[PDB]
Amino acid sequence: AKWDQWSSDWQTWNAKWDQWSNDWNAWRSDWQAWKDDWARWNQRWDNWAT
Amino acid sequence: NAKWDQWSSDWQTWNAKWDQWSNDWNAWRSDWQAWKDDWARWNQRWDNWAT
Amino acid sequence: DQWSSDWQTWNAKWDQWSNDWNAWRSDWQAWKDDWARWNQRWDNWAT
Amino acid sequence: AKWDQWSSDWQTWNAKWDQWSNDWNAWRSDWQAWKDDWARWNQRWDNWA
Amino acid sequence: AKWDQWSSDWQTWNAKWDQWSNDWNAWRSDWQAWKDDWARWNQRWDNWAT
């Protein structure tokens, strides 16, 4: 009962954590894609100015 | 089992706190993606300004 | 046993960390608003 | 004694958590320092207006 | 036994958390690097202006 309820509760937690982890992964990839766009825009303006 | 029910309550309590935190992070994540879109929008404006 | 006090201890750590994240979020939204204000200011000048 | 082993495991988890929290705190401090440098540069470009 | 299940599950959790920690730490490195690139570009534009 108790150890089976706890194993269920731990599975449910793990599922919640995994989905959060995936979302932070996705956000990380979005930040790196942003950082690449940022670099590319600086370049475009450097060429434009010089 | 009093101690077991206490723990169960403690675990449920912390999970609601996690869920609220996770909500707050989802909200922040949406605000960041709105900002990233604004940043692109203003890049386009400044590029228009120079063209 | 010692479990219940130990859990209370890490729970306080968590609550405090959560509040430090809320404080950073606050700071980030103030920064995002200032970023917007600066863009508006320069647009006002450049157009 | 199962509860004694769990108590030690929990000490190790708490020390790992504490490390992560110190690294989060240090990043926060870095971000605030960056925010201030960003505002100073805005104020600087504002002299080109 | 069930408690050997708990110890096992705990260790598996810790390995999954450790990967997340490592990933956040990698992200924090990439943010600092970005911060350096941002500081450099601000100088680059400061010179174009004088």
UniProtKB/Swiss-Prot annotation, chains A, E:
One of its GO terms (cellular component) is cell outer membrane. It is found in: Cell outer membrane; Secreted, Cell wall. Disruption phenotype: Double lpp-ompA mutants are spherical and only grow in the presence of electrolytes such as 30 mM Mg(2+), and are sensitive to hydrophobic antibiotics and detergents. The peptidoglycan layer is no longer attached to the cell outer membrane which undergoes abundant blebbing. GO terms for molecular function: identical protein binding; lipid binding; peptidoglycan binding. The keyword Transferase does not apply. GO terms for biological process: lipid modification; periplasmic space organization. It comes from the Bacteria. It is a lipid-anchor; Peptidoglycan-anchor. This is Major outer membrane lipoprotein Lpp. It comes from Escherichia coli (strain K12). The gene is lpp. The chain holds residues 25 to 74 of 78 of the full protein.
UniProtKB/Swiss-Prot annotation, chain B:
One of its GO terms (biological process) is lipid modification. About one-third of Lpp is covalently bound to peptidoglycan. It is found in: Cell outer membrane; Secreted, Cell wall. It is a lipid-anchor; Peptidoglycan-anchor. Sequence repeats lie at residues 1-11, 15-25. GO terms for cellular component: cell outer membrane; extracellular region; membrane; outer membrane-bounded periplasmic space. Disruption phenotype: Double lpp-ompA mutants are spherical and only grow in the presence of electrolytes such as 30 mM Mg(2+), and are sensitive to hydrophobic antibiotics and detergents. The peptidoglycan layer is no longer attached to the cell outer membrane which undergoes abundant blebbing. Residues 4-51 form a coiled coil. Belongs to the Lpp family. Keywords: Cell outer membrane, Cell wall, Coiled coil, Formylation, Lipoprotein, Membrane, Palmitate, Peptidoglycan-anchor, Repeat, Secreted, Signal. Homotrimer. Interacts with OmpA. Has been isolated from outer membrane preparations as an approximately 87 kDa complex, suggesting it also forms larger complexes. Seems to interact with TolB, Pal and TonB. In pull-down experiments interacts with CedA. The keyword NAD does not apply. The chain holds residues 24 to 74 of 78 of the full protein. An outer membrane lipoprotein that controls the distance between the inner and outer membranes; adding residues to Lpp increases the width of the periplasm. The only protein known to be covalently linked to the peptidoglycan network (PGN). Also non-covalently binds the PGN. The link between the cell outer membrane and PGN contributes to the maintenance of the structural and functional integrity of the cell envelope, and maintains the correct distance between the PGN and the outer membrane. Changing D47 to E/G/S: Does not affect the formation of murein-bound lipoprotein. The keyword Membrane applies. This is Major outer membrane lipoprotein Lpp. GO terms for molecular function: identical protein binding; lipid binding; peptidoglycan binding.
UniProtKB/Swiss-Prot annotation, chain D:
The keyword Signal applies. Disruption phenotype: Double lpp-ompA mutants are spherical and only grow in the presence of electrolytes such as 30 mM Mg(2+), and are sensitive to hydrophobic antibiotics and detergents. The peptidoglycan layer is no longer attached to the cell outer membrane which undergoes abundant blebbing. One of its GO terms (biological process) is periplasmic space organization. Sequence repeats lie at residues 1-10, 14-24. Belongs to the Lpp family. An outer membrane lipoprotein that controls the distance between the inner and outer membranes; adding residues to Lpp increases the width of the periplasm. The only protein known to be covalently linked to the peptidoglycan network (PGN). Also non-covalently binds the PGN. The link between the cell outer membrane and PGN contributes to the maintenance of the structural and functional integrity of the cell envelope, and maintains the correct distance between the PGN and the outer membrane. This is Major outer membrane lipoprotein Lpp. The lineage of its organism: Bacteria, Pseudomonadati, Pseudomonadota, Gammaproteobacteria, Enterobacterales.
